[PDB]
């Protein structure tokens, strides 16, 4: 589904291409003509943009920056995100397993060779 | 194209070939033109020879050593034609010139490569069949070139070496045509998918 802010909520089947539940901009992606029917799947209601909004920590009560904030440099995957990814992927993996060799198609990375040109390509 | 582009000047029209080449080299794209003795110029041979004999007569009479340099080799003849189509007096034009390379025959870093031909400058498509033309190589040998005979011999020796490569290619391609004749049931499901998608009609 597309979110309320217009950012597209997309996912990679994380067990396949290392893309979790993540927003992406509509104008910055290439939509292909290949669709998989994902009707009757359950998207949890708590996936607003406020969920994926970036959380910030610095700077609580530090004006002169001399002792560097060497903590929080590691963004930690909250367990809540883990269950949501597994929950959404649980009902989407068997469905993508149906159409043959979709996984390898999704495992692959789109690229250009010294042949084809994007205008000639029909996605 | 990152790779250098090799062209076969045989059957090509001097000005028609150079105009394409000059633009092609003004945009980067290092270009090599081999077999410069195969370039053809439109018009009967005698009137083209007179055009170069006129160019021989253009010369600074006070000091010809500073006058126009009448290069005689067909490569140098073609190279000079391109030089007129480039801004050679400016830095951009000089840099473009260095990207070009011209050869008589085919020297042996290039004979092992697939030559290319431009149709927009071919004598077959640009000249009416009932028109007289002239060879650059024959014209050059008649205005001072000293290497018509040796190039023709060396070019012939190159041709025979190519035939051996072509007989081997046909041998290996026939062997491959036999190969798909053998493996047929282990390939049918892979042939068919390429057939649904336009490859191998």
């Amino acid at each position: 589904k597309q979110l309320a802010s217009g950012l597209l909520l997309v996912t990679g089947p994380l067990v396949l291409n290392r893309v979790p539940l993540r927003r992406t901009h509509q104008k910055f992606v290439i939509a292909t003509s290949t669709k998989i029917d994902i009707s009757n799947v359950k998207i949890p209601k708590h996936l607003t943009d406020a969920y994926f909004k970036k959380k910030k920590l610095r700077k609580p009560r530090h004006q002169e920056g001399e002792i560097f904030d060497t903590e929080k440099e590691k963004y930690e995957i909250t367990e809540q995100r883990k269950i949501d990814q597994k929950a959404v992927d649980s009902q989407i993996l068997p469905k993508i397993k149906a159409i043959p060799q979709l996984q390898g198609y999704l495992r692959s990375v789109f690229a250009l060779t010294n042949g084809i040109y994007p205008h000639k390509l029909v996605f | 194209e990152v790779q250098v582009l090799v062209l076969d000047g045989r059957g090509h029209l001097l000005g028609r070939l150079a105009a394409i080449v000059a633009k092609q080299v003004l945009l980067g794209r290092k270009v090599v033109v081999v077999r410069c003795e195969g370039i053809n110029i439109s018009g009967n041979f005698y009137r083209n020879k007179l055009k170069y004999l006129a160019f021989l007569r253009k010369r600074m009479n006070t000091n010809p050593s500073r006058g126009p340099y009448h290069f005689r080799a067909p490569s140098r003849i073609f190279w000079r034609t391109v030089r007129g189509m480039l801004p050679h007096k400016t830095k951009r034009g000089q840099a473009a010139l260095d990207r070009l390379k011209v050869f008589d025959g085919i020297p042996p870093p290039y004979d092992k490569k697939k030559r290319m031909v431009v149709p927009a400058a071919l004598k077959v498509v640009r000249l009416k069949p009932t028109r007289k033309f002239a060879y650059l190589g024959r014209l050059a040998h008649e205005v001072g070139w000293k290497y018509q005979a040796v190039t023709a011999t060396l070019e012939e020796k190159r041709k025979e070496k190519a035939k051996i490569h072509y007989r081997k290619k046909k041998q290996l391609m026939r062997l491959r045509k036999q190969a798909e004749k053998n493996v047929e049931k282990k390939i049918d499901k892979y042939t068919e998918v390429l057939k649904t998608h336009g490859l191998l009609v």
Binding site: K27, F28, V29, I30, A31, V109, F110, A111, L112, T113, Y117, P118, H119, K120, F123 | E1, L26, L27, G28, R92, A95, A96
Partner: protein
């Protein structure tokens, strides 16, 4: 693991025979040799990538010697590909006959 951008060549600024306007550049994209083919690229973002001596901060990375002048393709220029583009700072003349990427950015597809 992918080229991911169209490769084009800086052909020169828009000009007459004796007046050149450096604020737009003419780019020849490999593979497009007609006006009607250019419709795909008419809004995409074109980048000119070069290197220098001093290191310059790289977003999402460490400092390096690469610098980029950004721009975007405006409208087709004449009967055979060779679209014309505008850049934030007018391109240096040393880039003529060099590579400019067309970056497949904002896509109407």
């Amino acid at each position: 693991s992918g080229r991911l951008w169209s490769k084009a060549i800086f052909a020169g600024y828009k000009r007459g025979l004796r007046n050149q306007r450096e604020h737009t550049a003419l780019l020849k994209i490999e593979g497009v040799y007609a006006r009607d083919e250019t419709e795909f690229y008419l809004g995409k973002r074109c980048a000119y990538v070069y290197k220098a001596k001093n290191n310059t901060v790289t977003p999402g990375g460490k400092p390096n010697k690469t610098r980029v002048i950004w721009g975007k393709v405006t409208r087709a220029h004449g009967n055979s590909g060779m679209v014309r583009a505008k850049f934030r700072s007018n391109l240096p003349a040393k880039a003529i006959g060099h590579r400019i990427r067309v970056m497949l950015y904002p896509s109407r597809i």
